[PDB]
Design a protein around this ligand. Structure first.
Ligand SMILES: *[C@@H]1O[C@H](CO)[C@@H](O)[C@H](O)[C@H]1NC(C)=O
Length: 97
């Protein structure tokens, strides 16, 4: 309920005080996914179980320097940094078959 309330306040941003903070959700985004030769791909729970703390941050970016209402979303995976740190980005480890 807290995450839903926060994202509601953000998408209906009318305060210019809040909505500048990325809202975090837990237990969402796996890291290690195997892509077999078939159609089905499998998120490996052996190498990393999805029952642990997995952070995913969100925030709605917008601006008027474009002189228009052209907004978009942006995600972030800053906790548990991997090589090529590059804050405010995502990374997926895939096991090809
Ligand atoms: C923003 O919209 C919500 C929708 O009800 C309202 O509760 C809130 O008071 C509004 N805030 C401002 C600053 O307009």
């Amino acid at each position: 309920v807290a995450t839903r309330n926060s994202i509601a306040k953000m998408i209906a941003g009318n305060d210019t005080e809040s909505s500048n903070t990325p809202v975090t959700i837990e237990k969402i985004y796996p890291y290690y996914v195997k892509a077999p030769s078939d159609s089905n791909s499998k998120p490996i729970k052996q190498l990393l179980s999805e029952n642990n703390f997995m952070n995913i941050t969100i925030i709605l970016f917008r601006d008027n320097v474009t002189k228009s209402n052209s907004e978009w979303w942006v995600l972030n995976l800053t906790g548990s940094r991997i090589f090529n740190q590059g804050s405010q980005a995502l990374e997926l480890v895939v096991f090809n078959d």
